Amino acid sequence: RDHRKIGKQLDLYHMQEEAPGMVFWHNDGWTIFRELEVFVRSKLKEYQYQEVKGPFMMDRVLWEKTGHWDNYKDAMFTTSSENREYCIKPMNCPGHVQIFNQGLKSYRDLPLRMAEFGSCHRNEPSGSLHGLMRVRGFTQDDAHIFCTEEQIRDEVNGCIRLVYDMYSTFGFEKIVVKLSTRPEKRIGSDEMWDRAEADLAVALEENNIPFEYQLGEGAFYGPKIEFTLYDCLDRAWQCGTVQLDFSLPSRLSASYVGEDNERKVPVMIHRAILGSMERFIGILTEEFAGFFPTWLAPVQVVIMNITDSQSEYVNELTQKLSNAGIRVKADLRNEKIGFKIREHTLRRVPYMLVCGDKEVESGKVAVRTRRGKDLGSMDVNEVIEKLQQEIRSRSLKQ
Amino acid sequence: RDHRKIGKQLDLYHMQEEAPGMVFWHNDGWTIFRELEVFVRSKLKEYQYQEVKGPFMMDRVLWEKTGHWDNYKDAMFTTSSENREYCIKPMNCPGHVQIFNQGLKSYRDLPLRMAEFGSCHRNEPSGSLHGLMRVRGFTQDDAHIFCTEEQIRDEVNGCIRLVYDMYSTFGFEKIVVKLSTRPEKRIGSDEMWDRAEADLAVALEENNIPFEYQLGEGAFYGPKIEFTLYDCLDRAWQCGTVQLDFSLPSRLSASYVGEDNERKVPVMIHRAILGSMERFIGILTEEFAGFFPTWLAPVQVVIMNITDSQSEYVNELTQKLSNAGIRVKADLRNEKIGFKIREHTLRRVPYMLVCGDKEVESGKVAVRTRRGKDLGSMDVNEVIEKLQQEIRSRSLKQLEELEHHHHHH
Ligand SMILES: Cc1nc(N)c2ccc(-c3cccc(S(=O)(=O)NC(=O)[C@@H](N)[C@@H](C)O)c3)cc2n1
Ligand SMILES: Cc1nc(N)c2ccc(-c3cccc(S(=O)(=O)NC(=O)[C@@H](N)[C@@H](C)O)c3)cc2n1
Ligand SMILES: [Zn+2]
Ligand SMILES: [Zn+2]
């Protein structure tokens, strides 16, 4: 099952030829995107990240300094104003360094972990575009960690642990790791590349991760660990990535005062855990075949009446569920109850609550699921507490 | 005092010449921006809005169809790929209509209220840029409501109610209101403009809102109610706006099946309540002189020790307040208590919890505020519950406080 077909059926998003590779998130798909942002934020809270927002575009001059112009030119969208040329950012790193560069820094500030849900644009050839997997405008759950050489091992280990921690929520059984080494066009010395590739290879082995080399596929600024997930057709897609950069901070004049009073350039680790939100949503859509776990489901509960005799009770329950923080809708249409149930089932709404006269008298609800399971009559507070528990725990099934 | 000065003082954001009019949001300014998004979302929910995201760019051909190319050329950034020209969006409306246009719509689907925190770029001349108030890249708390002619009154009224509801949280109740009428360069017939302008005036009148006309200041596609807020120099900034558009939906082939199975074109109401997030933060910054309400404050509480002896205790408390959902920092430095209070007052931190030996003993904290007020010792759990309530109610004013700092009484 193809995320593009499911995305249309569940009204998640669309794309059009007036904007190739550019996603229009509809309400329900955007709800998924936002829930993923909430999840990421909760994880970055524990791991102590800042969260920032950089500018959408910056002077071409700045992208010339980083090496992006010489090593990344063809991917970049450019625009002009008042005789100055700007690049729409294809990466968030240079903006993060700009923010790091505001205010004197010392060893006391390191490791400084700086995250952003960063909108990137990369001008992918149109013949290479595919659904949500390969687009031109996407958002990374990005971060750059500024640290000392002595902190590299712990900080890279932290990124690796974050990947497996977050991925375990979604239950991925196939996670293939690649180590992508020096590409033909690059910055930094061969010596720097030797150290950076060895640091990543050793980090993988210390974490007991079998990996394969992907020769020549590293970033222009540094080698990359890539966490690869697989779509329905078993095509490989880079999702999480951890990269070691001994070059950009220097090109952008980043420095701090060390514990020993020597002013030094910080090491920068680049990482994304999900990768791009769009691609990760494509993956989840296929992985679950549109049956999103309850915490991610655009609409968690639909409550239906049999006739308008139960309209008032249905409205009351809907407000009660909604105030409990559940994404709930009332379906009060003059349609047969079996017509309503089938519609919400096909929409993959996890839970459907049916209210007939028996339910109104008892203060209960008849509960069924999108898999056709019939949970019978349940008391309203019990369904609320069960749902709240499954949402709060981000449970994989139930 | 200017929001740009306070912005530096509180490390909210900065700007550089490498990106004129593009904001770099630091952690603490982004915290305020994010909390405003949460607040607006709470209202989108209550008022029954979808929330969507349109793409940054779309073909110039589409922008030509709207009348934006003729009427809005100067302000648009363009870029190209594979011999096709794209406009970076200056508004979110055309993207919303593209979403509406997916799948057959019926009168049953109306009113359809579609919100977006919509990132816009407008190529403002560099000479007229001004801090956060006038930038090139900004985010509107935007929405378009697609409705029938019979629904206009209720839907415009709903937007007006939403403006006063949201502004009341900040203590803005006496709002200056203008009705901006047809500009010299416009689309749509005189008849359509007469109607749209009357509809907005009747809505204001029905709501007992005094207003003035502002001739020729309407959007190219429709007239605008404008809600003005003032900065420290009493300069008038457009914040909230509610607009009536009988032109764009037809230009972009929007339709729905009416009750007699006839094809109809939806009316579109545009509105932003805060305006742009950047401009609204600038306004709040100046209005409160950086004394943001606790729910918005980048750092809500600072816990400080006197000597090394209380460091262990402060850390326990910081962890405890942090698990309770409060934005809290520890200040463990070898500095005098008064030195710390002055710093965190300049940082506008609502509450400062002072921990000496006697506090370690009794499991309590000595509470001070950024307004110089000594609130005595309180129990940790008492402080937590009171902060939680101040945050959840989005209270304008602090514990035991009559009047928050605000420039306009
Ligand atoms: C053209 C195109 N289309 C997509 N759909 C894409 C989807 C995802 C990615 C992608 C996502 C995360 C990371 C990277 S990366 O280039 O390997 N790395 C970076 O960008 C780093 N600067 C970042 C992790 O700090 C790339 C890149 C894409 N590029
Ligand atoms: C150039 C520039 N710089 C800013 N800082 C700006 C800050 C805010 C605004 C602004 C905010 C809200 C609304 C409008 S508007 O042009 O009047 N109206 C619209 O854009 C409508 N399409 C929308 C409300 O649906 C404009 C426009 C700005 N333009
Ligand atoms: Zn990066
Ligand atoms: Zn609009």
PDB file of N, CA and C in Angstrom, chain B residues 164-191:
ATOM      1  N   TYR B 164     -11.616  40.509  19.810  1.00  0.00           N
ATOM      2  CA  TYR B 164     -11.758  41.046  21.170  1.00  0.00           C
ATOM      3  C   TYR B 164     -11.490  39.970  22.219  1.00  0.00           C
ATOM      4  N   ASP B 165     -11.903  38.726  21.938  1.00  0.00           N
ATOM      5  CA  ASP B 165     -11.657  37.637  22.891  1.00  0.00           C
ATOM      6  C   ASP B 165     -10.140  37.493  23.079  1.00  0.00           C
ATOM      7  N   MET B 166      -9.399  37.323  21.981  1.00  0.00           N
ATOM      8  CA  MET B 166      -7.951  37.146  22.114  1.00  0.00           C
ATOM      9  C   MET B 166      -7.241  38.382  22.676  1.00  0.00           C
ATOM     10  N   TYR B 167      -7.652  39.580  22.265  1.00  0.00           N
ATOM     11  CA  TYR B 167      -6.964  40.805  22.739  1.00  0.00           C
ATOM     12  C   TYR B 167      -7.202  41.012  24.246  1.00  0.00           C
ATOM     13  N   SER B 168      -8.357  40.548  24.739  1.00  0.00           N
ATOM     14  CA  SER B 168      -8.682  40.719  26.165  1.00  0.00           C
ATOM     15  C   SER B 168      -7.679  39.981  27.066  1.00  0.00           C
ATOM     16  N   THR B 169      -7.131  38.863  26.594  1.00  0.00           N
ATOM     17  CA  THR B 169      -6.088  38.139  27.352  1.00  0.00           C
ATOM     18  C   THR B 169      -4.867  39.046  27.679  1.00  0.00           C
ATOM     19  N   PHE B 170      -4.574  40.002  26.790  1.00  0.00           N
ATOM     20  CA  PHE B 170      -3.420  40.933  26.919  1.00  0.00           C
ATOM     21  C   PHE B 170      -3.811  42.252  27.558  1.00  0.00           C
ATOM     22  N   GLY B 171      -5.101  42.365  27.860  1.00  0.00           N
ATOM     23  CA  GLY B 171      -5.672  43.573  28.433  1.00  0.00           C
ATOM     24  C   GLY B 171      -5.921  44.684  27.441  1.00  0.00           C
ATOM     25  N   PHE B 172      -5.987  44.361  26.146  1.00  0.00           N
ATOM     26  CA  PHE B 172      -6.337  45.334  25.134  1.00  0.00           C
ATOM     27  C   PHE B 172      -7.858  45.270  24.912  1.00  0.00           C
ATOM     28  N   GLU B 173      -8.580  46.269  25.414  1.00  0.00           N
ATOM     29  CA  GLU B 173     -10.051  46.282  25.245  1.00  0.00           C
ATOM     30  C   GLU B 173     -10.607  47.452  24.436  1.00  0.00           C
ATOM     31  N   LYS B 174     -10.027  48.634  24.617  1.00  0.00           N
ATOM     32  CA  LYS B 174     -10.415  49.801  23.810  1.00  0.00           C
ATOM     33  C   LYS B 174      -9.576  49.804  22.512  1.00  0.00           C
ATOM     34  N   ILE B 175     -10.039  49.112  21.474  1.00  0.00           N
ATOM     35  CA  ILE B 175      -9.247  48.983  20.240  1.00  0.00           C
ATOM     36  C   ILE B 175      -9.656  50.021  19.197  1.00  0.00           C
ATOM     37  N   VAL B 176      -8.684  50.693  18.585  1.00  0.00           N
ATOM     38  CA  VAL B 176      -8.958  51.603  17.463  1.00  0.00           C
ATOM     39  C   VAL B 176      -9.235  50.796  16.166  1.00  0.00           C
ATOM     40  N   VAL B 177     -10.382  51.089  15.543  1.00  0.00           N
ATOM     41  CA  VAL B 177     -10.858  50.301  14.424  1.00  0.00           C
ATOM     42  C   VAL B 177     -11.067  51.206  13.207  1.00  0.00           C
ATOM     43  N   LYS B 178     -10.635  50.716  12.042  1.00  0.00           N
ATOM     44  CA  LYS B 178     -10.798  51.410  10.747  1.00  0.00           C
ATOM     45  C   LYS B 178     -11.431  50.470   9.736  1.00  0.00           C
ATOM     46  N   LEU B 179     -12.168  51.047   8.782  1.00  0.00           N
ATOM     47  CA  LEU B 179     -12.685  50.299   7.636  1.00  0.00           C
ATOM     48  C   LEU B 179     -12.025  50.874   6.392  1.00  0.00           C
ATOM     49  N   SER B 180     -11.110  50.095   5.813  1.00  0.00           N
ATOM     50  CA  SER B 180     -10.342  50.530   4.663  1.00  0.00           C
ATOM     51  C   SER B 180     -11.062  50.160   3.354  1.00  0.00           C
ATOM     52  N   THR B 181     -11.353  51.168   2.574  1.00  0.00           N
ATOM     53  CA  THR B 181     -12.246  50.991   1.431  1.00  0.00           C
ATOM     54  C   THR B 181     -11.432  50.860   0.116  1.00  0.00           C
ATOM     55  N   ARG B 182     -12.150  50.688  -1.000  1.00  0.00           N
ATOM     56  CA  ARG B 182     -11.566  50.296  -2.278  1.00  0.00           C
ATOM     57  C   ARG B 182     -10.337  51.117  -2.697  1.00  0.00           C
ATOM     58  N   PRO B 183      -9.206  50.423  -2.981  1.00  0.00           N
ATOM     59  CA  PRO B 183      -8.002  51.137  -3.414  1.00  0.00           C
ATOM     60  C   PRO B 183      -8.095  51.437  -4.908  1.00  0.00           C
ATOM     61  N   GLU B 184      -7.238  52.332  -5.394  1.00  0.00           N
ATOM     62  CA  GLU B 184      -7.261  52.731  -6.807  1.00  0.00           C
ATOM     63  C   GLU B 184      -6.997  51.586  -7.754  1.00  0.00           C
ATOM     64  N   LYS B 185      -6.065  50.711  -7.393  1.00  0.00           N
ATOM     65  CA  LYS B 185      -5.806  49.484  -8.144  1.00  0.00           C
ATOM     66  C   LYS B 185      -6.504  48.296  -7.480  1.00  0.00           C
ATOM     67  N   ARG B 186      -7.523  47.759  -8.162  1.00  0.00           N
ATOM     68  CA  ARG B 186      -8.375  46.710  -7.593  1.00  0.00           C
ATOM     69  C   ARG B 186      -8.950  45.812  -8.666  1.00  0.00           C
ATOM     70  N   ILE B 187      -9.476  44.679  -8.231  1.00  0.00           N
ATOM     71  CA  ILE B 187     -10.258  43.790  -9.064  1.00  0.00           C
ATOM     72  C   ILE B 187     -11.694  43.734  -8.514  1.00  0.00           C
ATOM     73  N   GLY B 188     -12.661  43.373  -9.358  1.00  0.00           N
ATOM     74  CA  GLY B 188     -14.055  43.286  -8.922  1.00  0.00           C
ATOM     75  C   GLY B 188     -14.829  44.546  -9.267  1.00  0.00           C
ATOM     76  N   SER B 189     -16.134  44.418  -9.490  1.00  0.00           N
ATOM     77  CA  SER B 189     -16.941  45.535  -9.957  1.00  0.00           C
ATOM     78  C   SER B 189     -17.254  46.504  -8.811  1.00  0.00           C
ATOM     79  N   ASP B 190     -17.714  47.698  -9.172  1.00  0.00           N
ATOM     80  CA  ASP B 190     -18.126  48.698  -8.164  1.00  0.00           C
ATOM     81  C   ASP B 190     -19.239  48.164  -7.281  1.00  0.00           C
ATOM     82  N   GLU B 191     -20.157  47.422  -7.887  1.00  0.00           N
ATOM     83  CA  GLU B 191     -21.293  46.800  -7.206  1.00  0.00           C
ATOM     84  C   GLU B 191     -20.832  45.814  -6.122  1.00  0.00           C
TER      85      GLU B 191
END
